[PDB]
């Protein structure tokens, strides 16, 4: 091994124009795009959770535990997006934030009750996010990006499994306690959890 | 530039949420073969825990009196049970159902005239750790073959690195026991282990 | 009393073969065997409780208080087995661990509800263990082993009575609160007890 | 049904007897052992090059104390990268074989770029080369089916390598922005106190 002989083809590949990443290495456009797509997925879920917070924070709904949970969840989802934005820049890809569509605003449900409906929606959104994460992982693996696949596994896939179980447990408890007094009590639990 | 519509895309995720009470709500892309393989590994770890407990019980005998080895095997048994429990918790995180299986009777006596009890037991422990490593790698192969990305990662992250460390650690014990020789040497090594 | 006269009959009986216990004194094979049986009983209950924990830790069951209680109980039970293994060695008996059978995996019950059913099962297991402990004490007394009897009463019988009252109270409370909200509430109490 | 005492037989009589043989080694093929040794030499060589760069920037007539400190610290860290692989080799029961280290360049001045920018561009290229080498090592592991070696490379090296590449890229970018003379000296003061 001769660093100065083998580093030559590396020093000649150092970008000249100011707009090109100096760090980018073995990071293909398809991977860059998939990371941007996931940033948009996380940001969308953040926005949906913020909508759910705004619903449960209504005076006539008055489920303070669920409001707090969705408010904190929204904040956490934004962090998930930001971590991906930072990762994008670590790899020398360019972050491209995309539009975020209007979420629903009302989360009432006659049969299920608002709490259960909202938690079932949250569970489905977390499972949807997991599918998107597995897709980002598929793009990494298809393109042979070893470090991207590891990043997704280490920072996202495990936590997503945990998030899914946590919400699943909420759905289960909400189904057990039933509407009315039980839901209010579950909400108190969540308020103080 | 709209590339994702959560409320349109969850629709299929919503009408897939179980209604029957015995069904997991969390389970997602976790196939029966993976679930079974995790149950099998739980039983592997629990068996090893029981075997180490048998070894503790032997070295704790008044006439054997190797307190460092007894302590090591006792702590190893507890750690192995933790390895089993972490897999049990993982099963439930993935929405699989834990099924504890029977645990076979271990040997009770670990004497060996030629090698000496201490070296014999450490070589046995080494072989058990290597066997467990093989089982773990087999569990990993099941995940990779079925394309379970997160199960493969769990196994690598939580088990494989530690297993390599456990194997080197016990290998070092075997080497030292061989170096010090039977009698005074083994007793001294045991004192070291007792205070390690 | 002449220690050195009375002792020469005890000094020449000190075992010489390395496989023989030096400590063992007035400890008959039946007592040694009965101690090994109780070790297996305690270990079996540890395993059953671990199976109970694994059931209540399911996302769709989501009774965190019961899950925690059975998890801690499994650990406590293994400690009960271990203390008997150590006792065996104190008396110069040889520990022989035996097979542990596969326990039930599922604990749902349509009529009683899962929580009440599992607590009634736990109560029955503790009563069975008590019967086994009293049988062990009986073996000790039949054989005139004074210190084995003492060890069982001091270390096991009192604790067993407390465990049985504790679980009986859980059963009673579960019956009082009823299924649904009540069970979930009881579970919260247990979670924080 | 799992029977530890039956299945352990295969392994129990595979336990090596000769003092020279690893007791730990399991599913670790010669090609992986060799590739780990190669990477040890890669890291050690980069450590040596950074030490050469330290020695240049520490010259009284160059007097870029921030860059000197940065390269000195980088040299020590690179030696730690080498040593972690040496320890890993022993964890897996492979035999460490240290190789020769070639003479590095001693002077890092550059008429057009200026010494600071040239040295940082060189460092960036060295880190990218090391990344390619690490990915090669990972490829050897994957090709040979060594699950734990691949995991070790990803966990201990690849993420850190990405961070080191971004870090030095940022230095190159800043040196380009501030330009030669007062700007470089000021960047150097920043790095000195970083
Ligand atoms: Ca998320
Ligand atoms: Ca932030
Ligand atoms: Ca942040
Ligand atoms: Ca571009
Ligand atoms: Ca939990
Ligand atoms: Ca283990
Ligand atoms: Ca634990
Ligand atoms: Ca535990
Ligand atoms: Ca099933
Ligand atoms: Ca990993
Ligand atoms: Ca007990
Ligand atoms: Ca203990
Ligand atoms: Ca203890
Ligand atoms: Ca006997
Ligand atoms: Ca008494
Ligand atoms: Ca009381
Ligand atoms: Ca390095
Ligand atoms: Ca060091
Ligand atoms: Ca060799
Ligand atoms: Ca990995
Ligand atoms: Ca930074």
Q: What is the CATH number of the domain that holds D138?
A: 1.20.1260.10
Name the resolution in angstroms: 1.9
Q: How far is the CA of C82 from the centre of ligand 12 (A)?
A: 7
Does B19 lie at the interface with C, CB-CB under 8 angstroms? no
Number of H helices and number of E strands within chain B? 8, 0
Q: What angle do CA B167, B173, B176 make, to 5 degrees?
A: 140
Residue of A nearest to D165 (CA): A23
Whose CA is closest to C128, among C28, C48, C33, C29?
Answer: C48
Residue of B nearest to C56 (CA): B92
- How far apart, in whole angstroms, are the C-alpha atoms of residue C119 and residue C125? 10
Does C64 lie at the interface with A, CB-CB under 8 angstroms? yes
Are D22 and B171 a contacting pair at CB < 8 A? Answer: yes
Q: How far is the CA of B78 from the centre of ligand 8 (A)?
A: 9
3-state secondary structure chain D: CCCHHHHCHHHHCCCCCCCCCCCCCCCCCHHHHHHHHHHHHHHHHHHHHHHHHHHHHCCCCCCCHHHHHHHHHHHHHHHHHHHHHHHHHHHHCCCCCCCCCCCCCCCCCCCCCCHHHHHHHHHHHHHHHHHHHHHHHHHHHHHCCCHHHHHHHHHHHHHHHHHHHHHHHHHHHHHHHHCCCHHHHHHHHHHHCC
Q: What is the number of domains present in chain C?
A: 1
Range(s) of the domain holding residue B163: 1-196
- Residues of chain C found within 8 Å of residue A189, distances taken between Cβ atoms: 188
Q: How far is the CA of A107 from the centre of ligand 20 (A)?
A: 40
Buried b (16+ CB within 10 A) or exposed e, A144-178: ebbbbbbbbbebbbbebbebbbebbbbbbbbbbbb
Residue of C nearest to A167 (CA): C59
Are A6 and D158 a contacting pair at CB < 8 A? Answer: no
Q: Choose among B54, B74, B92: nearest Cβ to C59.
A: B92
Which ligand is closest in space to the CA of residue D167?
21
Does A161 lie at the interface with C, CB-CB under 8 angstroms? no
Beta bridge partners of B103: C100
Q: Enter the DSSP assignment of B182.
A: T
Q: Enter the DSSP assignment of C157.
A: I
Start-to-end CA span in chain C (Å): 57
HSE at residue A186, side-chain half, CA atoms within 13 A, is 28
Categorise residue D88: left if φ over 0, alpha if ψ from -120 to 50, beta otherwise. alpha
Q: Do chains D and C touch (3 or more CB pairs under 8 A)?
A: no
Q: Which chains touch C (3 or more CB pairs under 8 A)?
A: A, B
Q: Which chains touch B (3 or more CB pairs under 8 A)?
A: A, C, D
Distance (Å) from the alpha carbon of C188 to chain B's nearest alpha carbon: 20
- How far apart, in whole angstroms, are the C-alpha atoms of residue D23 and residue B168? 8
Other C-beta atoms within 10 Å of B23: how many?
Answer: 13
3-state secondary structure chain A: CCHHHHCHHHHCCCCCCCCCCCCCCCCCHHHHHHHHHHHHHHHHHHHHHHHHHHHHCCCCCCCHHHHHHHHHHHHHHHHHHHHHHHHHHHCCCCCCCCCCCCCCCCCCCCCCCHHHHHHHHHHHHHHHHHHHHHHHHHHHHHCCCHHHHHHHHHHHHHHHHHHHHHHHHHHHHHHHHCCCHHHHHHHHHHHHC
- How far apart, in whole angstroms, are the C-alpha atoms of residue C137 and residue A133? 60
Asked whether the beta carbons of C89 and B60 are under 8 A apart, the reply is yes
Does B114 lie at the interface with A, CB-CB under 8 angstroms? no
- Residues of chain B found within 8 Å of residue D10, distances taken between Cβ atoms: 131
B41 is in an annotated binding site: no
Q: How far is the CA of A186 from the centre of ligand 14 (A)?
A: 59
Distance (Å) from the alpha carbon of B16 to chain C's nearest alpha carbon: 15
- Residues of chain B found within 8 Å of residue A41, distances taken between Cβ atoms: 4
Distance (Å) from the alpha carbon of B4 to chain C's nearest alpha carbon: 29
Start-to-end CA span in chain B (Å): 62
In sequence order, the 6+-apart residues with CB closer than 8 A to the CB of B68 are: B189, B190, B191, B192, B193, B194, B195, B196
Name the experimental technique.
Answer: X-ray
Residue of B nearest to A150 (CA): B153
- How far apart, in whole angstroms, are the C-alpha atoms of residue B23 and residue B29? 14
Q: How far is the CA of C143 from the centre of ligand 15 (A)?
A: 15
- Residues of chain D found within 8 Å of residue B168, distances taken between Cβ atoms: 24, 90-91, 93
Beta bridge partners of C100: B103
Distances (CA, A) of C134 to B169, C14, C29, C129, D146: 44, 33, 18, 9, 55
Q: How far is the CA of A42 from the centre of ligand 1 (A)?
A: 5
């Amino acid at each position: 091994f001769e660093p100065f002989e083998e580093v030559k083809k590396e020093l000649d590949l150092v970008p000249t124009v100011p707009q090109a990443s100096l760090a980018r290495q073995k990071y293909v456009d398809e991977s860059e795009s998939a990371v941007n797509e996931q940033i948009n997925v996380e940001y969308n879920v953040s926005y949906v959770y913020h909508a759910m917070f705004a619903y449960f924070d209504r005076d006539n709904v008055a489920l303070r535990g669920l409001a707090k949970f969705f408010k904190e969840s929204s904040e956490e989802e934004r962090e998930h997006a930001e971590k991906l934005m930072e990762y994008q820049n670590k790899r020398g890809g360019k972050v491209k934030l995309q539009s975020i569509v209007m979420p629903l605003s009302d989360f009432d449900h006659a049969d299920k009750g608002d709490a259960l409906h909202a938690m079932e929606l949250a569970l489905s959104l977390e499972k949807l996010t997991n599918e998107k994460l597995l897709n980002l992982h598929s793009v990494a693996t298809k393109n042979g990006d070893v470090q991207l696949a590891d990043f997704v596994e280490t920072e996202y896939l495990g936590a997503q499994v945990e998030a899914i179980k946590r919400i699943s447990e909420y759905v289960a408890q909400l189904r057990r306690v039933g509407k009315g007094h039980g839901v209010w009590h579950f909400d108190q639990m969540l308020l103080h959890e």
